[PDB]
Design a protein around this ligand. Structure first.
Ligand SMILES: [Zn+2]
Length: 142
């Protein structure tokens, strides 16, 4: 599974799938760290968690009103913190095993993982500044 990550600096489209642990996606044209935001599936979820950077898993659905608001916020978060967070979007309509696994009840639900373990949970709309603060906090590496 692969997704296009667009470089903020030179505009290059970068098709990126699995990322070796210890590394973060970078632009193949100019070298800059990419905004690491992409779709995740039941099939890919365990691999999506195998990174060092904080992993922000966004359970969303087409019919969910607040998801239309939260999408752009997560997009800005990944752009502002390129390579310091991995945003994994999980369409619950299409990925029922992972939604059930984490006992998702409200849409949107945002879960934050660190080294494979759930470390935070945010139901409903969350301000981007609070998200940024929790991500930099986790980047202290704790
Ligand atoms: Zn670039």
């Amino acid at each position: 599974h692969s997704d296009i990550l667009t470089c903020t600096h030179c505009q290059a489209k970068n098709r990126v799938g699995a990322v070796p642990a210890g590394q973060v996606p970078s632009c193949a044209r100019c070298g800059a760290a990419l905004p690491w935001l992409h779709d995740g599936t039941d099939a890919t979820f365990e691999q999506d968690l195998q990174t060092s950077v904080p992993v922000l898993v966004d359970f969303w659905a087409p019919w969910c009103g607040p998801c239309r608001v939260m999408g752009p916020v997560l997009e800005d978060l990944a752009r502002d913190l390129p390579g310091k967070v991995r945003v994994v979007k999980v369409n619950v309509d299409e990925n029922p095993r992972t939604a059930a696994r984490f006992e998702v009840r409200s849409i949107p639900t945002l879960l934050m993982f660190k080294d494979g373990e759930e470390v935070d949970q945010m139901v409903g709309v969350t301000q981007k500044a609070a998200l940024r603060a929790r991500v930099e906090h986790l980047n202290q590496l704790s």
